[PDB]
Design a binder for this molecule. Structure first.
Ligand code: HEM
Ligand code: HEM
Ligand code: HEM
Ligand code: HEM
Lengths: 445, 99, 51, 56, 292, 80, 71, 380, 109
């Protein structure tokens, strides 16, 4: 068969709402694994300066203490069934994931129902996990692209709830007690901001009967009718530059505010971002690589790596490029990156956009190949897009994108805009912000 | 008759008297310099020896005697399987740029 | 020339038609404003009278 | 959209539109500024110049 | 080589295989610095002539029709239809390397001989690995059924990571303990882990923990199956080495057929065989192989 | 660590259409760009006046003198 | 022609050179010079010589034909 | 403790350009002409320094100031005739430099060649624009003819020629205009020669053989400064033979009357470096076609970077391209003789045939000559 | 493709001089007087260049040529008085540049 018939033959996600409003979705396929996870809409957003590390602390803390199965009885039960867990926490999503066999499904959803509602919070575990969180946050300074992405989120959205980290600062970790964490659990872990993603190996009527038995009546009504509210965060085009000249490699990111999740143009900004592409120095393509920024970078030995990202949040996104470069070619990488960006934005070709559309189609089906990242897509799509967009509709959104369409909405979201610039390392040969802005908008057009 | 006219043209060109074969007197463009990167080491070494000896001979404004002139039948076309590969690779690169 | 003639370069030239034509009108209007041509400045109604 | 936003969106964001705005405003600035400067000069001396004594 | 040696695991995995094998499997996965600059295209052509050939080649396809793949394989694979140059039989070497790195995290691993893949001793050895903690099943957890992690964490309080790893090749395999420790308590960590495998070898085992190891191995094999690149790697290695594809349910029946006495016999074989140890870090309290 | 870095209070410098944190900057982005480029263009029209008029003075000084213009008109041959 | 050390990568070539002060300044200036000038003019006189005699023929043609036509 | 020629920055750029510049060892006497043009421009600048100190620029006493220089000023005749015959030395060194540039494969130094033809346009403009300044009958009528042939363009021509005249004809404002222009133009020629040397020193020099000369390099000092001194001494031999023995031979004898607009010379003729320019302008019967042939004749050797169809660089190994190059310089000599001759039947048909053949050599026949070189040597 | 400002040598000179020069961010209005001296020297060269198109140097008609510059040619009064007052501005900027060099201790260059 063909591509459109094959992505039609990819099975649908039945999404259903329980008696409290919690959303349940599954993707039944042929494999015998089973990847049930709860996605909660809490994150670093919907946190103030107080209780800032509460989402990362509860992500760390939901496995260690339980009301019904106390101590390490969660670990003993999940290794009696032999399963694997995961807990990633982002700026707008926190999640709990179990990959298992499909014959352990009431044990998996019972362990999730004891994780997300009946988690106990012992103060000895609070002190021990506070020490482990402080040691991990000291270890996280080596994670330099995470440092630069956190600096970019600090300098891109200053004065907003998106300025703060997911982990929280060290002056805010040390004052987090139990009652602030259970206030965060009573506020932001509410049931219709929670989805139950399954992927293959399951049956949806079995999952809805088990969600009626276990994950029903979590919490629906607020305490004093005090609803949380999302705000449109201000994007401030700024520059932060952490200068460490003894450090070997400079990580510099440049990002413009993109439209975000609910706006329909993430496909065309992603196909511009995928025309620009990515490079690391272990890639054996050489000079003959298709992306001309990577071809120029390996032609004149500019940088070690560059990665072009479209990180999206609800109405606010960061789309840009982060490069690991040396101390002597940041001006070259910034000039050739803005030249490739606005060569794309002025002179986009049909061969370039069909290369990008093909690499986006392959990147989306390679992302949604595996059961754990397709559950990541099910949870993120159910919390953000409302419905879950199937890949036939993603193909129909991809196939309408042409070079003219890309040129004007690139002129909307790229041209003459003030970007946010972050840098950790030897940031001396970064240009100053007026040279970044003069290297944005073109001398010809 | 065409081989005799080509040998008379080889004698009238003057680099057979001076010590060079056909592929040393090429203009160093980016294709020829890519082939310069793409020769083997012994052919590169006696090619740059022949260019250095030719520069010594045109500094002295004299040539070798006739027993050690590079003959037309003694000419080897060493750069041509590298230069034709570089030219067809550049041709397929410009056809992919046109595509 | 032979490497510069193609479908992609014709599409890039079609993309660069209106801004280069507008830059040509920028150069023509600037040449008219610099030299003050009597045939052309007598058609604009704001400089219609004697200047 | 406010007052400068539409003119930014249609005649300032592209450099060719920027230079066309600069040249058209240069011609209009030439005629309007020469008329206003000669008007304020002849107001600062009406009868001293050769105009308004040219009756002879 | 610099990017793959930024990670500290791959360096002593390569030097572990260098000290654990004699001639064949002791050749490193990455090119050493003495051959960098001396790799010739004639030797590349001789190796791809003598070892890329049809009787050892297995070509697998997910989403591609079998008649189309049969046509493409017959239209481009008539060339190089021999059996190939025979690889040497790997023999066990033993001994240590112990070398200094310059970080507080000391990585030390002690292995010995296990059977080749496709043998009942190797099916016992993988379930003995999943009894003694093949990796972090829980993100940011404590791994509280792995007997190595319990018997090290009952005596040590510093941050660590004690796992057991199995690597079974076509001729001979390695089973052993990989301990990442701090430089002060690493002797207590390695000796407590080795005394835990001594307790498994005398037979201090629980049959529910053996059943949990069997379910851990069955679930981890299903994690290897469930990704399409992992499924392609699984049937590529099956059609390459064995030449036949067992069903994953038949693999689950073999893992359920492995019982407790084979785990006791394989633990006795690991504790009685000749060992090899690769270590890296500040080595002032790292124990020697004679001291174990 | 890296998470203890916060950008300080820029309320004394920033514009009043950007100063509230509940609004996006893309609504007033065209307004600030069309104010600052209006400042740039209204500078550049006077720079073009200073580069046109002074060049015209120098070109008309490189042209013929008024004494040469007075002497270049010939004597009037008149009716007789 | 960037600098004087990183220009070429040549190999196995040996250059012997004597002093200015251990050798003659005009070493066989006539007996090896006048055959060398004769060999160079033999190589290039068939290429540089017949355009100039075309120039001299056109010059004498133009002078004698203009003086014939001005009678 | 440290080297001064690589430490001190003026000495660093002097050492990099002049002392141990990597230069090819096999360059002939024809490569000396660029430094001969530099020292000839310096001797033109210093003789103009010592010439304009007694020169008064107005049409009542410009020729009287010239005769006061040649008679009443002590050693002023040597300065004025050295300046005129050094302009002749400058143009014969420029013509041999551009003949070397057309010969030895140095079209491909593209920005060097383009700023060279901008320099050549400025040198020709300052040569005519200083040839007006003695204010003779031949200089005034040559100024009138050369500026009047710029009036062939419709709608900008009479505006341009009253702009370049300052009147209805050449007068006092025209002479002071040309003296101010003749002061200012060789210094921007010298700055253009400095950045021409910079565009050369980006990629080094080249050999007569058209090869990459990076294998065999000698320092510029003392191997090329003594060839520079020998070239300077033979150039000063021919220049001082020109000033002290034959002072008005290369000049025109008709310039040495006082300037009079009421009469005309029996044939109007510009200088010997402008004779091929005047013959190319006289070849086309249309006057706009003549001034377009003038501009295209000076500019058509800048198209020689784009007219390199051969895979061999120099003309040393190109035997019938050598035939076409020597028939090009034969056409240049015939053009010089035809421009020296007055406008009579049949000099006009000889100038027409020679200008058509010169443009056919520089445009048509030499790229197909390079094509038949690489066809006869089996390149394709 | 390549960076033109760091590839072309005529553009490399202006990139090392006036575009990507490492300059301190401190420097006041007194440090602008060097570029003011260069620009006013360029307009003195251009102004005297367009002033010498009618100037005649002799002992009789130099003052007649100066008054022919002042009132007879089109707008030469502006060029002549611009040249005099720009020589005054040349020495104003030169004396304030010398006073800046004494003022801020740049004798070490
Ligand atoms: C009249 C002033 C000129 C000066 C002072 C001048 C100076 C020089 C110098 C110093 C060299 C290097 C030769 C050496 O030092 O060994 C040179 C070479 C060169 N010049 Fe000129 N030049 C002048 C005119 C021109 C013109 C008008 C052209 C364009 C046709 C030109 C094109 C070249 C080229 C292509 C080379 C490189 C090939 C060679 O070295 O002969 N030059 N010039
Ligand atoms: C900036 C340096 C120069 C100055 C100050 C200068 C100045 C003068 C002056 C004052 C005269 C008039 C005196 C006379 O009748 O000979 C003159 C004449 C002349 N100059 Fe120059 N000159 C300079 C450079 C050049 C150059 C580079 C050339 C060559 C292109 C040149 C070619 C001539 C010619 C041909 C004459 C006319 C000679 C005659 O017929 O008497 N000058 N120059
Ligand atoms: C001939 C007129 C002059 C010109 C065109 C000129 C040009 C310049 C320029 C462009 C700069 C760099 C801009 C800056 O850093 O200020 C500069 C700086 C400097 N100049 Fe000058 N300059 C002139 C006269 C002088 C004189 C007479 C002195 C000696 C007292 C001098 C000493 C310096 C010093 C010491 C600096 C660097 C420190 C500083 O700028 O405070 N300059 N000049
Ligand atoms: C190379 C370019 C220059 C040329 C060709 C030039 C030429 C002249 C001429 C022809 C005059 C006399 C006309 C007049 O003003 O009455 C003059 C006057 C003068 N120039 Fe220059 N000049 C030049 C640069 C300068 C500079 C850089 C200075 C400043 C140091 C300067 C200072 C003066 C002064 C003070 C006068 C007298 C002003 C007056 O009282 O009329 N000139 N110049």
């Amino acid at each position: 068969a063909t591509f459109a018939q094959a992505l039609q033959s990819v099975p649908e996600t039945q999404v259903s709402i329980l008696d409290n409003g919690l959303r349940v979705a599954s993707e039944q396929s042929s494999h015998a694994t089973c990847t049930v996870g709860v996605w909660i809409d809490a994150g670093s957003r919907y946190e103030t300066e107080k209780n800032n590390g509460a989402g990362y602390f509860l992500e760390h803390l939901a496995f260690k203490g339980t009301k019904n199965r106390p101590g390490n009885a969660l670990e003993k039960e999940v290794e009696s069934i032999g399963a694997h867990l995961n807990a990633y926490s982002t700026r707008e999503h926190t999640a709990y994931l179990i990959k298992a066999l499909s014959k352990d499904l009431p044990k998996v959803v019972e362990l999730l129902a004891d994780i997300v509602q009946n988690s106990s919070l012992e103060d000895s575990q609070i002190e021990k996990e506070r020490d482990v969180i402080l040691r991990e946050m000291q270890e996280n300074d080596a994670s330099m692209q995470n440092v630069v992405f956190d600096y970019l989120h600090a300098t891109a959205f200053q004065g907003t709830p998106l300025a703060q980290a997911v982990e929280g600062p060290s002056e805010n970790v040390r004052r987090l007690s139990r009652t602030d964490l259970t206030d965060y659990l009573n506020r932001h872990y509410k049931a219709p901001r929670m989805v139950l993603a399954a992927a293959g190996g399951v049956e949806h009527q079995q999952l809805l009967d088990l969600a009626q038995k276990h994950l029903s009546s979590v919490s629906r009504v607020y305490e004093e009718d005090a609803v949380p509210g999302l705000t449109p965060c201000r994007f401030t085009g700024s520059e932060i530059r952490h200068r460490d000249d003894a450090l070997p490699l400079a990580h510099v990111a440049i990002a413009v505010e993109g439209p975000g999740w609910a706006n329909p143009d993430n496909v065309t900004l992603q196909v511009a971002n995928a025309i620009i592409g990515h490079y690391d120095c272990t890639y054996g393509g050489g000079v003959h690589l298709s992306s001309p920024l990577a071809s120029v970078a390996v032609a004149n030995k500019l940088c070690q790596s560059f990665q072009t990202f479209n990180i999206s949040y609800s109405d606010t996104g960061l789309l840009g490029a982060h490069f690991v470069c040396d101390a002597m070619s940041i001006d070259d990488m910034v000039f050739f990156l803005q030249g490739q960006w606005m060569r794309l934005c002025t002179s986009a070709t049909e061969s370039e956009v069909t290369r990008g559309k093909n690499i986006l189609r392959n990147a989306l089906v390679s992302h949604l190949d595996g059961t754990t990242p397709v559950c990541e897509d099910i949870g993120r799509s159910l919390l953000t897009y409302g419905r879950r967009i199937p890949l036939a509709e993603w193909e129909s959104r991809i196939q309408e994108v042409d070079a003219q369409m890309l040129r004007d909405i690139c002129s909307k979201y790229f041209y003459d805009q003030c970007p946010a610039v972050a840098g950790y390392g030897p940031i001396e040969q970064l240009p100053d912000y007026n040279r970044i802005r003069s290297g944005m908008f073109w001398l010809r057009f | 008759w065409l081989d005799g006219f080509r040998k008379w043209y080889y004698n009238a060109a003057g680099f057979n008297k001076l010590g060079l074969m056909r592929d040393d007197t090429l203009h160093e463009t980016e294709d020829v310099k890519e082939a310069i990167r793409r020769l083997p080491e012994d052919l590169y070494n006696d090619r740059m020896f022949r260019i250095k000896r030719a520069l010594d001979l045109t500094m002295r404004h004299q040539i070798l005697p006739k027993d050690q002139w590079t003959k037309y039948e003694e000419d080897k076309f060493y750069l041509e399987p590298y230069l034709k590969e570089v030219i067809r690779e550049r041709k397929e690169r410009e056809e992919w740029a046109k595509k | 020339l032979s490497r510069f003639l193609g479908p992609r370069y014709r599409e890039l030239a079609r993309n660069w038609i209106p801004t280069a034509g507008m830059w040509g009108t920028v150069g023509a209007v600037g040449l008219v404003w610099a030299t003050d041509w009597r045939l052309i400045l007598d058609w604009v109604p704001y400089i219609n009278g004697k200047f | 959209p406010t007052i400068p936003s539409r003119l930014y969106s249609l005649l300032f964001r592209r450099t060719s539109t920027f230079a066309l705005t600069i040249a058209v405003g240069a011609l209009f600035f030439e005629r309007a500024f020469d008329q206003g400067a000669d008007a304020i000069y002849e107001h600062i001396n009406e009868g001293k110049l050769w105009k308004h004594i040219k009756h002879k | 080589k610099a990017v793959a040696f930024q990670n500290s695991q791959t360096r002593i995995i390569e030097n572990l295989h260098d000290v654990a094998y004699k001639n064949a499997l002791a050749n490193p996965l990455y090119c050493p610095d003495y051959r960098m600059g001396k790799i010739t295209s004639e030797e590349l052509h001789y190796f791809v002539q003598n070892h890329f050939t049809s009787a050892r080649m297995a070509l697998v396809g997910l989403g591609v029709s079998h008649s189309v793949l049969k046509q493409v394989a017959e239209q481009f694979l008539n060339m190089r239809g021999g059996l190939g140059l025979a690889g040497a039989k790997a023999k066990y070497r033993g001994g240590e390397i112990r070398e200094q790195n310059g970080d507080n995290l000391v990585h030390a691993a002690i292995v010995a001989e296990s059977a080749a893949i496709g043998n009942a001793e190797a099916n016992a050895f993988s379930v003995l690995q999943h009894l003694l903690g093949a990796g972090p099943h829980i993100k940011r957890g404590n791994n509280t059924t792995s007997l190595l992690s319990q018997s090290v964490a009952k005596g040590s309080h510093q941050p660590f990571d004690v796992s057991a790893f199995n690597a079974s090749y076509s001729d001979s395999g390695l089973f052993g303990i990989y301990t990442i420790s701090q430089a002060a308590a690493a002797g207590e960590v390695i000796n407590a882990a080795y005394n835990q495998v001594k307790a498994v070898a005398q037979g201090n085992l629980s049959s529910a923990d053996v059943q949990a190891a069997k379910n851990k191995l069955k679930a981890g094999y299903l994690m290897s199956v469930e990704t399409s690149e992992g499924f392609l790697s699984e049937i590529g290695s099956q059609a390459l080495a064995a030449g036949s594809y067992m069903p994953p349910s038949t693999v689950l029946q073999q893992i359920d057929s492995v019982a407790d006495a084979d785990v006791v016999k394989a633990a006795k074989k690991f504790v009685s065989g000749k060992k090899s140890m690769a270590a890296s870090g500040n080595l002032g309290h790292t124990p020697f192989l004679d001291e174990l | 660590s890296h998470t203890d870095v916060k950008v300080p209070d820029f309320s004394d410098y920033r514009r009043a259409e950007v100063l509230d944190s509940t609004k996006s900057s893309k609504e007033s982005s065209e307004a600030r760009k069309g104010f600052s480029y209006l400042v740039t263009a209204t500078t550049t029209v006077g720079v073009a006046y200073a580069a046109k008029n002074v060049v015209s003075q120098f070109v008309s000084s490189m042209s013929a003198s008024a004494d040469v213009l007075a002497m270049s008109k010939i004597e009037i041959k008149l009716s007789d | 022609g960037r600098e004087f050390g990183n220009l070429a990568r040549i190999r196995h070539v040996i250059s012997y050179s004597l002093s200015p002060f251990e050798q003659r300044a005009f070493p066989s200036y006539f007996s090896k010079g006048i055959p060398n000038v004769l060999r160079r003019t033999r190589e290039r006189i068939l290429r540089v010589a017949p355009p100039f005699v075309v120039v001299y023929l056109i010059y004498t043609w133009g002078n004698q034909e203009f003086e014939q036509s001005k009678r | 403790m440290t080297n001064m020629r690589k430490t001190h920055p003026l000495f660093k750029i002097i050492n990099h350009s002049f002392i141990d510049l990597p230069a090819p060892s096999n360059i002939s006497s024809w490569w000396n002409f660029g430094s001969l043009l530099g020292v000839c421009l310096m001797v033109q600048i210093i003789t103009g320094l010592f010439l304009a100190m007694h020169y008064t620029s107005d049409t009542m006493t410009a020729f009287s100031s010239v005769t006061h220089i040649c008679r009443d000023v002590n050693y002023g005749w040597l300065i004025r005739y050295m300046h005129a015959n050094g302009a002749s030395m400058f143009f014969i060194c420029l013509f041999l430099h551009v003949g070397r540039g057309l010969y030895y494969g140095s079209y491909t130094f593209m920005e060097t060649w383009n700023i060279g033809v901008l320099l050549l346009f400025a040198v020709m403009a300052t040569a005519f624009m200083g040839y007006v300044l003695p204010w003779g009958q031949m200089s005034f009528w040559g100024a009138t003819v050369i500026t009047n042939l710029l009036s062939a363009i419709p709608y900008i021509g009479t505006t341009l020629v009253e702009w370049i005249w300052g009147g209805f004809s050449v007068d006092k404002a025209t002479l002071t205009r040309f003296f101010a222009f003749h002061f200012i133009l060789p210094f921007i020629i010298a700055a253009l020669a400095i950045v021409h040397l910079l565009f050369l020193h980006e990629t080094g020099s080249n050999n007569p053989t058209g090869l990459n000369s990076d294998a065999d390099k000698i320092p510029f000092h003392p191997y090329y400064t003594i060839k520079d001194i020998l070239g300077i001494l033979i150039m000063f031999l021919i220049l001082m033979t020109l000033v002290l023995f034959f002072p008005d031979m290369l000049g025109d004898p008709d310039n040495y009357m006082p300037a009079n607009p009421l009469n005309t010379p029996p044939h109007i003729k510009p200088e010997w470096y402008f004779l091929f320019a005047y013959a190319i302008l006289r070849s086309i019967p249309n006057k706009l076609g003549g001034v377009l042939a003038l501009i295209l004749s000076i500019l058509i050797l800048a198209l020689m970077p784009f007219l390199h169809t051969s895979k061999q660089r120099s003309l040393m190994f190109r035997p019938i391209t050598q035939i076409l190059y020597w028939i090009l310089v034969a056409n240049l000599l015939i053009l010089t003789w035809i421009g020296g001759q007055p406008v009579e039947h049949p000099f006009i048909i000889i100038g027409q045939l020679a200008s058509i053949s010169y443009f056919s050599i520089i445009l048509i026949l030499m790229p197909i000559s390079g094509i038949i070189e690489d066809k006869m040597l089996k390149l394709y």
